Design a protein around this ligand. Sequence first.
Ligand code: FMI
Length: 294
Amino acid sequence: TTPLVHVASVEKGRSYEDFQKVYNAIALKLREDDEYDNYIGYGPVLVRLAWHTSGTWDKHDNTGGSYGGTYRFKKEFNDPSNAGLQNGFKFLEPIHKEFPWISSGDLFSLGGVTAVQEMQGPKIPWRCGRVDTPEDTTPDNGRLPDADKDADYVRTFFQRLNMNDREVVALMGAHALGKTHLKNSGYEGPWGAANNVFTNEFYLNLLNEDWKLEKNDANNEQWDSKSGYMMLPTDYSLIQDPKYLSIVKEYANDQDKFFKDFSKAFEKLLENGITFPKDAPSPFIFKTLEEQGL
Ligand code: FMI
């Protein structure tokens, strides 16, 4: 039961160029399969997948985390908390088939990095080396957070992922992406207008929209605005708690600051639980398709 140590191990003989090729394949498919989810694209769901495959981590015993790529196993794949992520996994299938040498954990996390960057978000340094672990290393369901709670719940929950107030608020900004789907989570609606463009719209909407606490068709409460946006109880708690509120205001007034803080928190989230050898390669910063003229 002793806390295991997960040492990053570079896929045999691979280097930056190999991973840039995987990034490009993911990016090109994001461009190709643009009809998904009423033309939102697979960007948002890939980010959620990267988060859910990483968010199972427990700093106390180093179980869960992005290292093992255990989402490929039935128990985790069927976690009610992961409902809807099968779409992201299916999207990545052809990618993994073309580059069978990349580990599942590296692919799931790289998918999130690729999506954020291609959607015009900040650059996210990414490190390779996650290694697939056995099915018995799959974490039990119930480690991912709930959305019907308050600020105190959020703050306490994220301490298990070693995230502080600023890290939590920055990470939640990803809700500028995609939307909630009633069938997947019991919540319905987008957080903003630019569902597939990474910006600080989440914070601006929290502060500027006129929110009303209503019940959706699943009989769950959520905050709605006449603009057609919604906020989860946990999202709204970010402006109810005074400490979170200060940070929300900061990001709503400084796009660059949000980008830099989100980049650090997201990489941290994707790297929790991994031990990188002193001579491991430095983090990779991939060029977007646009930057490559592709
Ligand atoms: C770093 C990014 C990130 C973080 C930290 C983070 C944290 C947390 N999220 Fe969030 N998320 C992200 C990114 C991130 N999310 C994205 C991109 C989506 C959109 C998915 C899609 O559109 O398919 C969604 C969608 C989504 C949905 C709707 C799911 C659906 O119906 O399809 C719910 C209910 C929640 C709940 C919660 C919390 C509050 C409870 C688990 C939470 O703590 N999320």
